[PDB]
Write a protein that binds this DNA or RNA. Structure first.
Lengths: 420, 13
DNA sequence: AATCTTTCCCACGGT
DNA sequence: TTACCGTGGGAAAGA
């Protein structure tokens, strides 16, 4: 017999105590391919996070039902999706996150883009499912030519996220990533920050608050790097193009994926952002012999820049454990209003077994494809028993529910608006 | 239009 | 032919 | 020590 569908009582219980389980996959947007038998590792290393109070709640539910601590532990593997390459086990013991440090894509694969695939299950072998990263672009190797804006793929837009790493003399063991921990910037061998790179106007003064501009980042512009997790920022920097071990003062082409970069601390005496082992410091450059447009910089002052991305999936077993994996997890990107009032959902991974709920009211739902769903907006009287029209604004959560009771929360709400 | 962030001081050599 | 991308080659300085 | 291994610069092949 089919499993039990979500009851209104169980939806009310969820809305009161929202114990969601979330999987996050953080990763770079591009990756250089490996030829022959070599391994050119993904840098920064993709990182899986188990977020939300739901993991602890789920762990206690399993142990209440007889599971040992080891059987309630989540397990995870990661690999190139849809490939013959082998998956690699992540170590999640004692932590809520793990990095995959030795992934690579062979030129046996002929695809131009791929996704990472994260397979998860509990120690008792109960399946969770398979979660996919965002799309990753394969490059053979970076071009030597100035980057054209016609290929936005390889450029960096103001306000997006980058990672930055330094490597000494071609040695994989020396790789260090810019990262914020305990209020301080440092250069981590194991973790990496994803920093917004904001373009500032040339005349913007140093300050806690600043005005950001739109457009693609070019060498020679002033930028602000802000940790997307901690909110910490560095002082105003001028991002400069590195050639061998010099910074070019006069280059102004667009910044390209995986290019080497130097960050001049604005309004200083030739001071550049520099690591020294784990420490982040500023270090003075030396003017070049007979060349005024270039400055010699410290080994620690050369940073490789790469755009990063984030896949995020959230689920909750609204009627308890189910046989089917909870994946593919639907993701709602937007809601659009559009006879009877209909609400259009746009996103990914929609299926015909989903229903839209407004609050604790299940709505008539029409599946169209994996990216689009239509539902009928409930009359206002389902939320205010006396109302024959909308007297004051009323806001309700929007939630996707599967026929076996899995609940997929969105961050989005619907608001009933009074008639003006 | 506007952003905000606490600025970390970069120590010198 | 000439020029940019893709693939092949190999040594430095790491474990 | 030797054997082995990512990485980046460069040569060669492909478009």
């Amino acid at each position: 017999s089919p499993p039990k569908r979500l009851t209104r009582e169980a939806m009310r219980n969820y809305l009161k105590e929202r114990g969601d389980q979330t999987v996050l996959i953080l990763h770079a947007k591009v990756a250089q391919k490996s030829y022959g038998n070599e391994k050119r590792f993904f840098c920064p290393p993709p990182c899986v996070y188990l977020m939300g109070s739901g993991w602890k709640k789920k762990k206690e539910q399993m142990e209440r039902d007889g599971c040992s601590e080891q059987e309630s532990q989540p397990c995870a593997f990661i690999g190139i999706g849809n490939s013959d390459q082998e998956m690699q086990q992540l170590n999640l013991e004692g932590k809520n996150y793990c990095t995959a440090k030795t992934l690579y894509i062979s030129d046996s694969d002929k695809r131009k883009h791929f996704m990472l695939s994260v397979k998860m299950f509990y120690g008792n072998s109960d399946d969770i499912g398979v979660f996919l990263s965002k799309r990753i672009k394969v490059i053979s190797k970076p071009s030597k030519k100035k980057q054209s804006l016609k290929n936005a793929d390889l450029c960096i837009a103001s306000g997006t996220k980058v990672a930055l790493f330094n490597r000494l003399r071609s040695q994989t063991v020396s790789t260090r990533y810019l990262h914020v921990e305990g209020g301080n910037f440092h250069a981590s061998s194991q973790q990496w920050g994803a920093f917004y790179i904001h373009l500032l106007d040339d005349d913007e003064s140093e300050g806690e608050e600043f005005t950001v501009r739109d457009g693609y980042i070019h060498y020679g512009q002033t930028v602000k790097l802000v940790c997307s997790v901690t909110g910490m920022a560095l002082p105003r920097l001028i991002i400069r193009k590195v050639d061998k071990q010099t910074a070019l003062l006069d280059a102004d082409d667009p910044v390209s994926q995986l290019h080497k970069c130097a960050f001049y601390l604005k309004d200083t005496e030739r001071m550049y952002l520099c690591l020294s082992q784990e420490r982040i410091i500023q270090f003075q450059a030396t003017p070049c012999p007979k060349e005024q447009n270039k400055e010699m910089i410290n080994d620690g002052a050369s940073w490789t820049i790469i755009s990063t991305d984030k896949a995020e999936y959230t689920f909750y077993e609204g009627m308890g454990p189910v046989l089917a994996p909870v994946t593919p997890v639907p993701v709602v990107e937007s809601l659009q209003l559009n006879d009877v009032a209909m609400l259009e959902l746009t996103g990914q991974n929609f299926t015909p077994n989903l229903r839209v709920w407004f609050g604790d009211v299940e709505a008539e739902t029409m599946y169209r494809c994996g990216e689009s769903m239509l539902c009928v907006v409930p009359d206002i009287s389902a939320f205010r028993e006396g109302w024959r029209w909308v007297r004051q604004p009323v806001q309700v959560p929007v939630t996707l529910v599967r026929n076996d009771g899995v609940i997929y929360s969105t961050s989005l709400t619907f608001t009933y608006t009074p008639e003006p | 239009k506007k952003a905000t962030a606490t600025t970390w001081m970069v120590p010198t050599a």
